[PDB]
C-alpha cells in the first residue's frame, strides 16, 4: 500500500540524486511528484559540475539556476555530452597553464566554431568528422596562422618546425582523398616546413578510424600512393589529452616562449660533481623516413653548475665523445672538439643548453659518452662529465598498405 510516490521528500531526493541525467528527465514523465522533484536545482548540480565542468563561479556569472544551465548547455554542445567533460578539461587546462606562461598562443586562439561551419565542412569533405573532434573544435576553432603554434615546435640549427592547430575551413580546404592518404584530414600545419599531423576521418588504407599520424613519404618507393605513417595517439581525444597532459605536467619544456616537443625522462640524469647534465630527446618526421629507415632524432642537453659551488672550480668543454647505439648493436663514435662547434663555459649560475641532431638508422637507439672538460685556471687538469644513457624512441610507425600489398 506504500509506494515510491508515498516516500518523503528527503529520501526521494536522495534516491534521485543517484540517477543519471537521462533518468532524471525520464522521471519527469512518470508522475507529478517525481516531475516536481526532478526539477530540483541541486539535482542538476552533480549532473552539471561533471558533465560540462561548469563551476560555481560560472553559475554566479550567468546567474541562472542549475537546470537552466544544463538545458542551455545541452542545446549547444549536447550531442558531444560523453566527450565534452574530457576535452574542455584539457582545453581549460592548456589555456590555464599558458596564462602565466606564453601568452601569445592563447591570444592567437579563435573563439568557438558554430555548428554551421562544421556542417559545411562535413558537406565539403563528404565524410563525417569524429564527434570528439567536433566538440574540441566547437570549444575552440584553433588559431589563425601565427608562429609559434599550439601543438608544439622543434628548433634545430637549420630546420625549424612549428605546428599550429588548423581551423575547420582550412582543414576542409586541405582535406586529402588521394590514393594512399585517403580520407585523411589535417589537424595542423607548419608553414615553415609543411608538417601535417593528419587524422583519419574514415577507416581506410590500413588505418583504423580516428587515428592521428604524421605524414612520412616513402623515399625508396616511387609509388605516389606510398605514404608511411607515424601514429601518435589512439583517437583525437587521446591525442589532444595526451598533449595537454604533457604540456601541463612539465614534460614539454618552454623554450624561446614556445612549446617544444622535447620528451624528457627524469631518469636521464648523470650529474657528476657540481656539474648537472640533463638531456631531452625529440623526434622529427620531416627529416625521418621509413624506407630507407632514417628515423631522425634531436636532443638538447641542459648542462649547468649550481650556485652553491664556489667560482674557483671553473671549467670549459672541449670534447664530445658519443656512443651511438642502434637496435642492431652497431656503435659509432664522434670525437670532434667542442659541442656544436662551440666551447661553452660552465660556471656557478651559468646554464648552457644546445640543440644537436642524431641519425639512429633503426627504430630504437640510445647514446652515452663524455665531455671531458678542461679546467680554466688549471690548463692541465681535466674533469669528466658523463652524459646519461638516454633512450631515443620513434613512435609506432605503419608501413603503407600499398607497400604491404606490393611485393
Amino acid at each position: 500500500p506504500l509506494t515510491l510516490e508515498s516516500l518523503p521528500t528527503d529520501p526521494l531526493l536522495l534516491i534521485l540524486s543517484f540517477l543519471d541525467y537521462r533518468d532524471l528527465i525520464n522521471c519527469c514523465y512518470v508522475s507529478r511528484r517525481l516531475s516536481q522533484l526532478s526539477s530540483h536545482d541541486p539535482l542538476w548540480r552533480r549532473h552539471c559540475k561533471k558533465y560540462w565542468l561548469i563551476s560555481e563561479e560560472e553559475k554566479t556569472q550567468k546567474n541562472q539556476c542549475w537546470k537552466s544551465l544544463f538545458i542551455d548547455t545541452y542545446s549547444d554542445v549536447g550531442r558531444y555530452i560523453d566527450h565534452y567533460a574530457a576535452i574542455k578539461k584539457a582545453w581549460d587546462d592548456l589555456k590555464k597553464y599558458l596564462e602565466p606562461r606564453c601568452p601569445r598562443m592563447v591570444l592567437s586562439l579563435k573563439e568557438g566554431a558554430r555548428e554551421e561551419d562544421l556542417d559545411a565542412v562535413e558537406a565539403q569533405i563528404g565524410c563525417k568528422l569524429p564527434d570528439d573532434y567536433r566538440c574540441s573544435y566547437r570549444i575552440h576553432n584553433g588559431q589563425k596562422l601565427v608562429v609559434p603554434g599550439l601543438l608544439g615546435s622543434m628548433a634545430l640549427s637549420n630546420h625549424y618546425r612549428s605546428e599550429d592547430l588548423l581551423d575547420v575551413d582550412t582543414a576542409a580546404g586541405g582535406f586529402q582523398q588521394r590514393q594512399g592518404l585517403k580520407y585523411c584530414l589535417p589537424l595542423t600545419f607548419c608553414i615553415h616546413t609543411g608538417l601535417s599531423q593528419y587524422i583519419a576521418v574514415e577507416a581506410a588504407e590500413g588505418r583504423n578510424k580516428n587515428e592521428v599520424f604524421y605524414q612520412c613519404p616513402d623515399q625508396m618507393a616511387r609509388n605516389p600512393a606510398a605514404i608511411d605513417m607515424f601514429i601518435i595517439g589512439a583517437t583525437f581525444t587521446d591525442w589532444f589529452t595526451s598533449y595537454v597532459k604533457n604540456v601541463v605536467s612539465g614534460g614539454f619544456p618552454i623554450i624561446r616562449d614556445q612549446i617544444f616537443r622535447y620528451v624528457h625522462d627524469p631518469e636521464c640524469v648523470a650529474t657528476t660533481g657540481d656539474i648537472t647534465v640533463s638531456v631531452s630527446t625529440s623526434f622529427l618526421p620531416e627529416l625521418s623516413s621509413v624506407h630507407p629507415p632514417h628515423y631522425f632524432f634531436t636532443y638538447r642537453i641542459r648542462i649547468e653548475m649550481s650556485k652553491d659551488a664556489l667560482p674557483e672550480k671553473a671549467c670549459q668543454l672541449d670534447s664530445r665523445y658519443w656512443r651511438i647505439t642502434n637496435a642492431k648493436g652497431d656503435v659509432e663514435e664522434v670525437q670532434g672538439p667542442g659541442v656544436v662547434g662551440e666551447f661553452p663555459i660552465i660556471s656557478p649560475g651559468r646554464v648552457y643548453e644546445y640543440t644537436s641532431c642524431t641519425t639512429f638508422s633503426t627504430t630504437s637507439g640510445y647514446m652515452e659518452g663524455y665531455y671531458t672538460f678542461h679546467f680554466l685556471y688549471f690548463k692541465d687538469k681535466i674533469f669528466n662529465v658523463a652524459i646519461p644513457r638516454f633512450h631515443m624512441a620513434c613512435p609506432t610507425f605503419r608501413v603503407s598498405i600499398a607497400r604491404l600489398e606490393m611485393g
Partner: protein
C-alpha cells in the same frame, strides 16, 4: 557488554549493543547528549515510527556493519555511483518493494547513513535506465497527468529526445 533497549511500535523489545546502535546518528546523539550522560535505568527507548520486522532488519544490518570503516565525506564531483554496493549488502536488500521502502523510512528516521545510502542505491538501480512505462510497471504509480499536463511536460523536456 554495554547495551541499550530499542522498542518497536508493535511492542517488541530488542536489545542492541550500544557500540552497534551508535551507528544510527539519532541514537548516537540521544545517548551522547541525554541518555548515557544521565544513565537511564535501562528503560526501553521507544521508536514509534518503525515496526518490529524493520527494526530487526536494521539491527541485523548494523551488526553486520558494526566494524564498518567511516564513510568517505565527499560529494558533488566525487560522483557517487550505484555499483559499489557490497555483495552482502546486495543480498540483504533482496526484499519486495514494500519492505525496502519501509527500510528506507526507518533509515531516514534513525539517520543511519550507510543503510540509507545503500537502500537509495538499490532503489536508484531499480530505476536507472528504464522507460517511463517500465518505471510505472516496476513500481505502482497511476499516471496523474492529464493530456494538457502530458503535452506541457513533453514540450518542456523534448530536448533529451534524439
Amino acid at each position: 557488554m554495554p547495551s541499550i533497549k530499542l522498542q518497536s511500535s508493535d511492542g517488541e523489545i530488542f536489545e542492541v549493543d550500544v557500540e552497534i546502535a551508535k551507528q544510527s546518528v539519532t541514537i548516537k546523539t540521544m545517548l551522547e547528549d541525554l541518555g548515557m550522560d544521565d544513565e537511564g535505568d535501562d528503560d526501553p527507548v521507544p521508536l514509534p515510527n518503525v515496526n518490529a520486522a524493520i527494526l530487526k532488519k536494521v539491527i541485523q544490518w548494523c551488526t553486520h556493519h558494526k566494524d564498518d570503516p567511516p564513510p568517505p565525506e565527499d560529494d558533488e564531483n566525487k560522483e557517487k555511483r550505484t555499483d559499489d554496493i557490497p555483495v552482502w549488502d546486495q543480498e540483504f536488500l533482496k526484499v519486495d518493494q514494500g519492505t525496502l521502502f519501509e527500510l528506507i523510512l526507518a533509515a531516514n528516521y534513525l539517520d543511519i547513513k550507510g543503510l540509507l545510502d545503500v537502500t537509495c542505491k538499490t532503489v536508484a538501480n531499480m530505476i536507472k535506465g528504464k522507460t517511463p512505462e517500465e518505471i510505472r510497471k516496476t513500481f505502482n504509480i497511476k499516471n496523474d497527468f492529464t493530456e494538457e499536463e502530458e503535452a506541457q511536460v513533453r514540450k518542456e523536456n523534448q530536448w533529451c529526445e534524439e
